[PDB]
Amino acid sequence: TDLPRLPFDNPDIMGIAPQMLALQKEGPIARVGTAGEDAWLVTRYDEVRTLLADRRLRLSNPNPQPSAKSAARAFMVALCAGDDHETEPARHAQMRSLLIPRFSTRRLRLMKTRIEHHVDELLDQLAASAPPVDLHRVLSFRLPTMVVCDLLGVPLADRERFGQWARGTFDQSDNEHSANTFQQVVDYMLELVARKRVEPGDDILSELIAEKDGALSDADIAHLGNAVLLFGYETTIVRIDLGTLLLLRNPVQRAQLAEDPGLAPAAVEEILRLGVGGKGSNALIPRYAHGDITVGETVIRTGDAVMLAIGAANYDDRAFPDGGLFDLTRVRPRSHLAFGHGARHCIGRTLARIELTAVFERLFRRLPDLRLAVPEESLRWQEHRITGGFDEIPVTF
Numbered sequence: 001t002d003l004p005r006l007p008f009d010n011p012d013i014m015g016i017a018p019q020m021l022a023l024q025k026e027g028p029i030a031r032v033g034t035a036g037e038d039a040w041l042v043t044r045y046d047e048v049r050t051l052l053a054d055r056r057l058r059l060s061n062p063n064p065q066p067s068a069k070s071a072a073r074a075f076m077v078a079l080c081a082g083d084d085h086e087t088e089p090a091r092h093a094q095m096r097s098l099l100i101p102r103f104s105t106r107r108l109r110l111m112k113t114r115i116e117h118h119v120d121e122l123l124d125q126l127a128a129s130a131p132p133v134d135l136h137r138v139l140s141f142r143l144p145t146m147v148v149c150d151l152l153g154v155p156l157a158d159r160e161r162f163g164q165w166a167r168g169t170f171d172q173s174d175n176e177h178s179a180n181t182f183q184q185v186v187d188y189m190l191e192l193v194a195r196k197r198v199e200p201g202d203d204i205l206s207e208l209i210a211e212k213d214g215a216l217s218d219a220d221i222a223h224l225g226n227a228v229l230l231f232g233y234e235t236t237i238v239r240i241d242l243g244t245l246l247l248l249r250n251p252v253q254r255a256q257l258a259e260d261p262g263l264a265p266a267a268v269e270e271i272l273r274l275g276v277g278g279k280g281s282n283a284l285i286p287r288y289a290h291g292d293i294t295v296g297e298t299v300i301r302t303g304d305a306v307m308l309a310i311g312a313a314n315y316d317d318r319a320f321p322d323g324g325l326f327d328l329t330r331v332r333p334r335s336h337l338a339f340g341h342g343a344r345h346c347i348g349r350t351l352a353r354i355e356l357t358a359v360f361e362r363l364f365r366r367l368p369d370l371r372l373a374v375p376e377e378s379l380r381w382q383e384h385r386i387t388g389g390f391d392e393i394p395v396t397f
């Protein structure tokens with residue numbers, strides 16, 4: 001008997017670590033070590049989906065002497081209103097209540113139109129340039145930051161100011177850098193709130209300022225805007241990179257999609273399901289048990305940490321036949337867990353799907369000879385950032 005320790009090694013640049021798949025073959029739940037507390041690791045689709053819907057399993061830590069966390073994880077939990085287990089029910093309910101109507105069908109319809117034109121322009125610029133080109137910098141990075149500028153109602157050049165702040169805030173390796181970056185986010189957002197109070201527009205902070213006849217404080221409003229800024233582009237960038245790499249790996253699927261862009265929605269769902277990078281520490285949703293929960297044979301006790309492996313679950317053969325295969329022709333595939341499930345189900349997921357669909361409708365049609373200009377093995381998943389990701393994707397075309 002050898003206690004497994006997260007994170008597990010992955011000899012590939014994508015996919016699930018072999019040891020996590022081995023645990024998943026054994027059963028749905030295993031006790032593992034981490035860099036901090038030991039935790040229950042749940043790796044099968046059915047059990048992860050069930051626990052994501054279990055109101056006893058929450059983000060906030062109920063423990064009296066809570067384990068220490070990196071500055072990055074503390075900021076992420078506070079942005080998600082999970083920093084105080086006694087106030088999480090009301091604060092999280094208000095958070096979702098205030099954020100969900102900012103992504104209305106009216107707004108998403110307008111943004112889809114703008115996103116499509118912007119991808120067209122981004123790809124014209126790419127196709128006219130001289131290889132090798134960093135696809136990450138000129139495509140993956142540019143579309144989601146454009147979108148966040150649209151949501152916040154700021155000039156597009158602002159993303160050159162804030163484009164690295166998600167990475168810096170969520171740098172688990174440097175508490176000083178994390179804290180200094182977050183202060184920059186706070187300073188910027190407070191500037192923006194004060195501007196929108198006298199110069200509002202069709203944007204998210206203006207709507208919050210107007211909300212409940214102005215009942216929200218500027219600190220409340222900036223807090224929600226920080227969540228939009230820090231959650232609203234970085235993970236989407238990562239999915240554009242992973243989707244590009246996955247399609248480059250599967251030429252038959254890529255050719256199907258180039259021929260029929262109507263397969264883009266199905267490709268986007270396969271990209272989300274299979275898009276896991278490096279050791280995939282970001283494909284785990286963390287929780288604490290606020291009450292005892294039984295998982296098959298295993299009792300999770302109040303206070304226990306739980307890692308719900310949405311990545312592993314999305315690869316689960318029990319839920320997806322040939323779960324490791326990229327397949328554009330899956331008949332009625334189960335809903336993947338890449339946006340989570342239940343109480344904290346991703347608020348931006350419809351917008352994120354709009355962005356990924358617009359890209360992969362166009363990418364291999366516009367650049368039919370696109371391919372990596374370096375070996376895959378030279379691509380470097382950034383394990384120290386909560387959101388992982390590659391720093392560059394050199395391509396030719």
Ligand code: HEM
Pocket residue numbers: 059080096099227228231232233235236239285286337338339340341343344345346347348349351352
């Ligand atoms: C492909 C891109 C994205 C992925 C893979 C993703 C993934 C996720 C996941 C797994 C969660 C659940 C976390 C948990 O259960 O604790 C989540 C929550 C959240 N996401 Fe997304 N997300 C994406 C894009 C976005 C975008 C574009 C926005 C906003 C513009 C956004 C806003 C949020 C917010 C505010 C939450 C917190 C929900 C809550 O705690 O109630 N996300 N995201």
Ligand SMILES: CC1(C)C[C@H]2C=C(C(=O)O)[C@@H]3COC(=O)[C@]4(CO4)[C@]23C1
Pocket residue numbers: 231235282283284285286386387388
């Ligand atoms: C709010 C989040 C940015 C969304 C989720 C997706 C992530 C990711 O794709 O990197 C983040 C990684 O860290 C987490 O705890 C997550 C899995 O919940 C995320 C928090």
